[PDB]
Amino acid sequence: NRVMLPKAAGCGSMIQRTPKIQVYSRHPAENGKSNFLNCYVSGFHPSDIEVDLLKNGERIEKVEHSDLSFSKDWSFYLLYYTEFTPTEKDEYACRVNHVTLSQPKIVKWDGSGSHSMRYFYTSVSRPGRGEPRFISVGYVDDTQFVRFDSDAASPREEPRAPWIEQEGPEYWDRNTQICKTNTQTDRESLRNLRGCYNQSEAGSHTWQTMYGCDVGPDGRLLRGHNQFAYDGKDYIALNEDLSSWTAADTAAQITQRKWEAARVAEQLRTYLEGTCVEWLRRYLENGKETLQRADPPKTHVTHHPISDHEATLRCWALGFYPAEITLTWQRDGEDQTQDTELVETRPAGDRTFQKWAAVVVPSGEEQRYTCHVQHEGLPKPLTLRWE
């Protein structure tokens, strides 16, 4: 359940991040069995992006995508997907265009007891094209359960998980109202922030908000969060004591003084210690058969010679939930952090996640390397060695 957010105060630099692209199937592809083709685009900023799935060079028409969300560094991620039945010869790919790319990039298809709730908000101004685009999503751990999009035909808080559908009309009305109010608050924040940095109305800017709570196995608050970012950079954050702010620059300090006088932190603390933890506890009980079940990774190692004297060892983890995982390659038990290539953890589309880690080793020394896997679904870490 949401909270109404404060407005940045009236009184420049901008991050650009290039998308990371992975193309893959949800489950091992079968030459005659239905599957899902996934294109996962992550780590990018700003949020404007174009993603198409290709079949034999042709653009696939019925492609869905996940609701815009972002990672701790404020960078965005999206999953694009479609059901498909792969064949021996049909060739699939993903094409991505973004301001950081000089041409569209084509990639060919080759527990613990602790929990969290987060709401993520993204407002993006659209100069000359109407009002800002407002998109908000809510998560329990790595399970999305609501979304709100100001460009929907009838914008409202919408269910995205089965265990939230039982909430009554008061819940949907209340959270829809909070979203609609926050849309207008964000529009006012964007206007105020332009003034703080002497920016005209002609440029597009991004205002992102996150808040939420972490609880332990007994349901107690472990810590609360509320942070804001402008154009991809930290702007102001509630400190861990839930009683003070950290402001990134002189503009944000003006907001800090306004929110101090308005006792914003006290209101957020009240929400984080009460409503946030109480509703998270409710969701964990109502969705316990999925939310309180950890799925351990299914793991294996592959081996690819790259020359007469070196080979690639790749450690795969598949089908795990929640998304947090650690894959490490060791030589004689010592971490090879510098030499290990990792990919961003990616969604299969069915709640679970996937990840791999690779290392290049001298041919003949493969047996001195082990892959170490840590996941909360494992009683103890797993170790794998190539045969």
Residue numbers in the entry: 323 to 333, 999 to 1097, 1999 to 2275
Paper text:
Human leukocyte antigen (HLA) B∗39:06, B∗39:01, and B∗38:01 are closely related class I MHC allotypes that nonetheless show differential association with T1D. HLA class I molecules consist of an allele-specific heavy chain that is associated noncovalently with β2-microglobulin (β2m) and a presented peptide. The α1 and α2 domains of the heavy chain form the peptide-binding groove, which is characterized by six pockets designated A-F. In general, two well-conserved primary anchor residues occupy the B and F pockets and are located at position two and the C terminus of the peptide, respectively. Upon identifying a peptide that binds to both HLA-B∗39:06 and B∗39:01, we determined the respective X-ray structures of the two allotypes presenting this peptide to 1.7 Å resolution.
For elucidation of the crystal structures of HLA-B∗39:06 and B∗39:01, the peptide selected was NRVMLPKAA, which represents amino acids 320 to 328 of human NACHT, LRR, and PYD domains-containing protein 2 (NLRP2). Thus, to obtain the protein in quantities suitable for X-ray crystallography, HLA-B∗39:06 was produced in mammalian cells as a secreted single-chain peptide-MHC (sc-pMHC) in which the NRVMLPKAA peptide, human β2m, and the extracellular domain of the HLA-B∗39:06 heavy chain were joined with flexible linkers. To enhance protein stability, a substitution was made at position 84 of the MHC heavy chain (Y84C), which leads to the formation of a disulfide bond between Cys84 and an additional cysteine introduced at the second position of the linker connecting the peptide and β2m. Consistent with the finding that Arg at position two of the peptide is a preferred residue for HLA-B∗39:06, the structure revealed that the side chain of this anchor residue is located in the B pocket and makes polar contacts with B-pocket residues Ser24 and Glu45 of the B∗39:06 heavy chain. However, in our structure, Ala8 of NRVMLPKAA, and not Ala9, occupies the F pocket and forms polar and van der Waals contacts with F-pocket residues Ser77, Asn80, Trp95, Thr143, and Trp147, while Ala9 is solvent-exposed. Superposition of H2-Kb and HLA-B∗39:06 underscores the 8-mer peptides OVA-8 and VSV-8 overlay with the first eight amino acids of the NRVMLPKAA peptide with RMSDs of 0.95 Å and 0.84 Å, respectively, over the eight aligned Cα atoms. This analysis suggests that the covalently tethered 9-mer peptide NRVMLPKAA binds to HLA-B∗39:06 analogous to an 8mer, with Ala8 occupying the F pocket. Additionally, our HLA-B∗39:06 structure suggests that for 8-mer peptides presented by this HLA-B allotype, the residues that are solvent-exposed and likely available to participate in interactions with a cognate T cell receptor (TCR) are at positions four and seven (Met4 and Lys7). Consistent with this behavior, we found that Val3 of the peptide forms van der Waals contacts with multiple residues of the MHC heavy chain, in addition to a hydrogen bond with Tyr99.
